[PDB]
Design a protein around this ligand. Sequence first.
Ligand SMILES: O=C(O)Cc1noc2ccccc12
Ligand SMILES: O=C(O)Cc1noc2ccccc12
Ligand SMILES: O=C(O)Cc1noc2ccccc12
Ligand SMILES: O=C(O)Cc1noc2ccccc12
Lengths: 150, 150
Amino acid sequence: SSPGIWQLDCTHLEGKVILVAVHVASGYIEAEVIPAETGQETAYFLLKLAGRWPVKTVHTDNGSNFTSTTVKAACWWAGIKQEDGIPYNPQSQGVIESMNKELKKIIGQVRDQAEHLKTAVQMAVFIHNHKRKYSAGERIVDIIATDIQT
Amino acid sequence: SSPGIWQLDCTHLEGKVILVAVHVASGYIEAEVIPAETGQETAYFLLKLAGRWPVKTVHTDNGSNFTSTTVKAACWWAGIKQEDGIPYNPQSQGVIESMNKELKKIIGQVRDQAEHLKTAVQMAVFIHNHKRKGYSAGERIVDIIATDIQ
Ligand SMILES: O=C(O)Cc1noc2ccccc12
Ligand SMILES: O=C(O)Cc1noc2ccccc12
Ligand SMILES: O=C(O)Cc1noc2ccccc12
Ligand SMILES: O=C(O)Cc1noc2ccccc12
């Protein structure tokens, strides 16, 4: 069911890790800076996400997180179906790659306004989600609202 | 404009601080554990919130955050109108008090499943936002904002 599908994405900058969740149908994202991508960090990020949006299915970003007992525990707790993130359609991976580049670009554009990387990442989340193309933020709300009325 | 109005709420547990943002019209919340309520922590929390939902107006939780230059900078950056949180209608404060009690109760009910308080708080956020009262707070916020976009 399209409304509930999210994709995990892990990218790197300034020797740190940026963990991203993308709502596939809308392009809407949430993101956090973590010291490194562990099962525990990924599990906590998914718990936060699922408390905030109706997360039905997650395409995990790699096999370590797919295997992780802590990630599996979080998915069980929050009612998330954990799936692999293998792009059976290969245009999927190019879209994520492009987004990581887009996000890094925005981070560079705001980097001066923020002392800490985590502030710059949240500025980038804001700009990404508000960007008129409707915005991603508008699309996710419309998609989920339409789904609730069924 | 009702769709964009949020209220900040700071409550305490286990010698730590839980910062909550409530979407007034729906009862939907986001929350985080912080070591203490500083301007900088509050500013960052508001930036995160406004990147994720269309935050137009925030009723700040106290005068220190209302005054804070860092909070004012975040509100300017994110396009948020900062207002005081004085309950000109006094039933407002009782609703927040009740929610803090409700959240603490849920935290107690899950506390055993979580090693860290921050995990228990996000479990409580999840349970609060999914609770059917019939629609949930998560369903209501999406419906309110979708109606407003159109
Ligand atoms: O128990 C913890 O604090 C580890 C943890 N971090 O995130 C979680 C999500 C679900 C279940 C457990 C966790
Ligand atoms: O994109 C907008 O300007 C309005 C908006 N509508 O819904 C949103 C959700 C998240 C973020 C922003 C929004
Ligand atoms: O990293 C900083 O510059 C401080 C900061 N923390 O959170 C913010 C939000 C908006 C603007 C600035 C900040
Ligand atoms: O509350 C629900 O069961 C589904 C739901 N619909 O929209 C939401 C937004 C946030 C969290 C949960 C939801």
